Amino acid sequence: ENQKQIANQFNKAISQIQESLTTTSTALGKLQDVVNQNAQALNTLVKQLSSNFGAISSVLNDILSRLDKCEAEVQIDRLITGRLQSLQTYVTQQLIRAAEIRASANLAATKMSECVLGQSKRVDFCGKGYHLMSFPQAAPHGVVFLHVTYVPSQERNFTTAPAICHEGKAYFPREGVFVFNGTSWFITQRNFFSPQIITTDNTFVSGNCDVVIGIINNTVYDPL
Amino acid sequence: SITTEVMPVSMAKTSVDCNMYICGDSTECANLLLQYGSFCTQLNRALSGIAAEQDRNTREVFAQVKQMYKTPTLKYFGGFNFSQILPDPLKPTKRSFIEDLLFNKVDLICAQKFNGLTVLPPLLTDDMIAAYTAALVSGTATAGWTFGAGAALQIPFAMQMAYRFNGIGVTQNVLYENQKQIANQFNKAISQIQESLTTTSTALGKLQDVVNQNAQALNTLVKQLSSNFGAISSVLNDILSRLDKCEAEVQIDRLITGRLQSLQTYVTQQLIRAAEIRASANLAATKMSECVLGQSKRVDFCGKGYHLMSFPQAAPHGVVFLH
Amino acid sequence: SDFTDSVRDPKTSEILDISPCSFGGVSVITPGTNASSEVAVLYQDVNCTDVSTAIHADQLTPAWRIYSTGNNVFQTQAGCLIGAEHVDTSYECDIPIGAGICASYHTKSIVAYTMSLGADSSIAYSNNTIAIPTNFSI
Amino acid sequence: GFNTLKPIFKLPLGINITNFRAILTAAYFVGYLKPTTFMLKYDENGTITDAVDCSQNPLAELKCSVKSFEIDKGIYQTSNFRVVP
Ligand SMILES: *[C@@H]1O[C@H](CO)[C@@H](O)[C@H](O)[C@H]1NC(C)=O
Ligand SMILES: *[C@@H]1O[C@H](CO)[C@@H](O)[C@H](O)[C@H]1NC(C)=O
Ligand SMILES: *[C@@H]1O[C@H](CO)[C@@H](O)[C@H](O)[C@H]1NC(C)=O
Ligand SMILES: *[C@@H]1O[C@H](CO)[C@@H](O)[C@H](O)[C@H]1NC(C)=O
Ligand SMILES: *[C@@H]1O[C@H](CO)[C@@H](O)[C@H](O)[C@H]1NC(C)=O
Ligand SMILES: *[C@@H]1O[C@H](CO)[C@@H](O)[C@H](O)[C@H]1NC(C)=O
Ligand SMILES: *[C@@H]1O[C@H](CO)[C@@H](O)[C@H](O)[C@H]1NC(C)=O
Ligand SMILES: *[C@@H]1O[C@H](CO)[C@@H](O)[C@H](O)[C@H]1NC(C)=O
């Protein structure tokens, strides 16, 4: 009934993403931190070659240049031990960081499986609101999902009843709730306000109206 | 039936002073420690990252509502007694009755402060974690599925359980003909938790194990200062008291290497432990997102049986769900 | 740990405690060097009545004695914060200090406040009413 | 102000020097050196063009703890450069 103004909201929401992406530069902070961490670790590994670890000098061609093959064994061995344990520290930190990156990659893979190739009913897994569809985009060492969602707005107050009874038989709704306008009782779905006249077809009968708490008398239209 | 599920969120935030641990108040050992350049900054960076990650876990599990709902004055919603999991206005505590039952079941610290080991306090206090969970329980009773899906929409609590019976394939009229029976069973299942939480102490073991592991690691880090690593003695003020500047260079440089590798072993163990705690915190975040704010159809994700709703409660370094 | 705590004086035969010269923790809060050159100093796990004794403030330069006692003293559950003007109202968190206190650079000076959890609101509960949306957004 | 001092000359004369006395034919100022911790910056010529004293300010202690002259916004933990036995 209103396809034209839904398509205008989807064209406007796509356009507002560029106006957010062009101006700022801190929206992709989860991708710059990976680059910073790797570059910092590798630069520290380079800068730890200037330490001497208790030897006479940090330069290996300075121990060999002024000591024979006889006293320079202990200094070279101290330097080798220090540089080996520095390299092992770097590899251990890299292994732990690879583990956390793999955890995030598995999450991205299952999000792509369950939200791009289909529609997911898991709450807040793929955006805020009720999920409709999704679009993947690439990014430097990463992926960016554009989750499109339906969000209700402009709530309205009503007074409601759990059931009604026409001739001593309780009529429960099939889908939706009973609501009360200025003069009459209607039946509505809960995520939109489309008030439909109450009919025998969309309500079902179970029991008498002497045990349900808070039942309100009305009449049920019959297609006859 | 109401089933409890306990899971950890964050662990203790710690930080070590490298110069105080390796060479405590010794000027000669400090000048010998600057030769091992860029070896304590690389370690304090890791520990600070761990601490910030712990604060992020605590924020991300609980702060899932942008809007804070006040607890209603009436705690009786259509026959279901909610007064046992919501804060009591007359009582002096700002926590639920069940949360108070959870906070009670979970010469060594002096030697830690002297050697540069400090435990930082958490950013969100226990009165703000327990003020978040009084806005998720009170939003679940007065509103429904939509306070996490958008604007909060008011609904009676009898009509919220009729939609939650439609989610499991049972018609609406099953609720309304015997609403009093279900309301009596829901009051009884809440009361049976307190008779189980008060007596035993083997329910919050997953939260006690975290405390035990962190305290044991820190105490072993302290107790490894008494080793000498092949030097003449383990006391740095005993080598410097009786050895000149020519002989004590090789004796000090055996203590510095051993204490450095002991600190590095502690930091590696803490990094792996922080990884597994973060995995548990991510599971807690998605369980709160998918089972408190809505109704889940995933089998045995949120209890045994067909899920209806859920309530979160705070606990020392963790969260307790009542599915 | 093999660290001497007490020692006996060989002449007067009394007992003396030995403790480290500066034990504890000190933290510095900055708005950035390119923003200003003022700082705020936090002493951890130290009651702020005896911060001057635990730092040995008598043997310091006069630029350290203005971060030891003044009219800008705040006492948090982390410790004592000196240099930050306490404000009663609450905003979002900018610099996480600990135990519910944050600090920021406001109007300029460094202020320390309690962090705000979220927007304060309320929804009424009535047993015969409902709220149903009428419009939507994509 | 600020002015770095270049080395003119070192003399191999082995005596104790505990007094001195200027020789005049204006004013002069005498200050004594103390053992402290500085952080010095060397440019591409090989000259000291900036220096910070780690025992003066909490900000300077922070600058020496991070080992930089530019500090980003946040809370940092600093070492002990303020007290000497
Ligand atoms: C519904 O009524 C309540 C009080 O009866 C009021 O506070 C609320 O704003 C109303 N809802 C709307 C959407 O106006
Ligand atoms: C719905 O309720 C409003 C109340 O303002 C009333 O004006 C309107 O006529 C009602 N709808 C119908 C179809 O009667
Ligand atoms: C709603 O609550 C009011 C006040 O407690 C009560 O008078 C009324 O009977 C209730 N109505 C229903 C349908 O429960
Ligand atoms: C709800 O349970 C508490 C538990 O002691 C009880 O004190 C209170 O009266 C109950 N509320 C009722 C019966 O409305
Ligand atoms: C040792 O010398 C001190 C200093 O004069 C004196 O006070 C003390 O009486 C002497 N004797 C003993 C047994 O300490
Ligand atoms: C307040 O200062 C006293 C001084 O000794 C100290 O014992 C006490 O623990 C301090 N209070 C707190 C809460 O730390
Ligand atoms: C919903 O909002 C849009 C724009 O805000 C408006 O054009 C439309 O008429 C609204 N729907 C109704 C039913 O009024
Ligand atoms: C270094 O010396 C060269 C030649 O004297 C000069 O051109 C250059 O500017 C100097 N570097 C700096 C930083 O001034």
Numbering used by the authors:
A (entry chain B): 900 to 1123
B (entry chain C): 703 to 808, 830 to 1046
C (entry chain B): 556 to 662, 672 to 702
D (entry chain B): 212 to 236, 250 to 309
What did the authors write?
Among structural proteins of Sarbecoviruses, spike (S) protein is responsible for receptor binding and mediates membrane fusion between cell and virus to initiate infection. RBDs in SARS-CoV-1 spikes were observed to be in the “up” and “down” positions making the spikes exhibit open and closed conformations, respectively. We introduced these three disulfide bonds in equivalent positions in the SARS-CoV-1 S sequence generating three spike variants: S/x1 (S370C and D967C), S/x2 (G400C and V969C), and S/x3 (D414C and V969C). We determined cryo-EM structures of SARS-CoV-1 S/x1, S/x2, and S/x3 spikes and we identified various previously undetected conformations for SARS-CoV-1 S through classification procedures.
By cryo-EM, only symmetrical S-trimers were observed for SARS-CoV-1 S/x2 and S/x3 spikes. The S/x2 spike adopts symmetrical locked-2 and closed conformations. The S/x2 locked-2 spike protomer displays cryo-EM density showing an ordered 602–619 region in Domain D, highly similar to S/x1 locked-2 spike protomer. Surprisingly, the lipid-binding pocket is unoccupied even though the entrance to the pocket is closed by the gating helix. In the locked-2 conformation, the highly dynamic region between residues 602–627 in Domain D (Domain D-loop) undergoes drastic refolding to adopt a fully ordered “Domain D-loop conformation-1” with several mini-helices within the loop. A change of Domain C–D hinge region structure allows residues R306 and F578 to interact with W619 and the Domain D hydrophobic core by cation–π and hydrophobic interactions, respectively. These interactions likely still rigidify this region to maintain the more tightly packed locked-2 conformation. Under native conditions, x2 disulfide is more resistant to reduction by DTT than x1 and x3 disulfides, likely reflecting different local chemical environments for different disulfides.
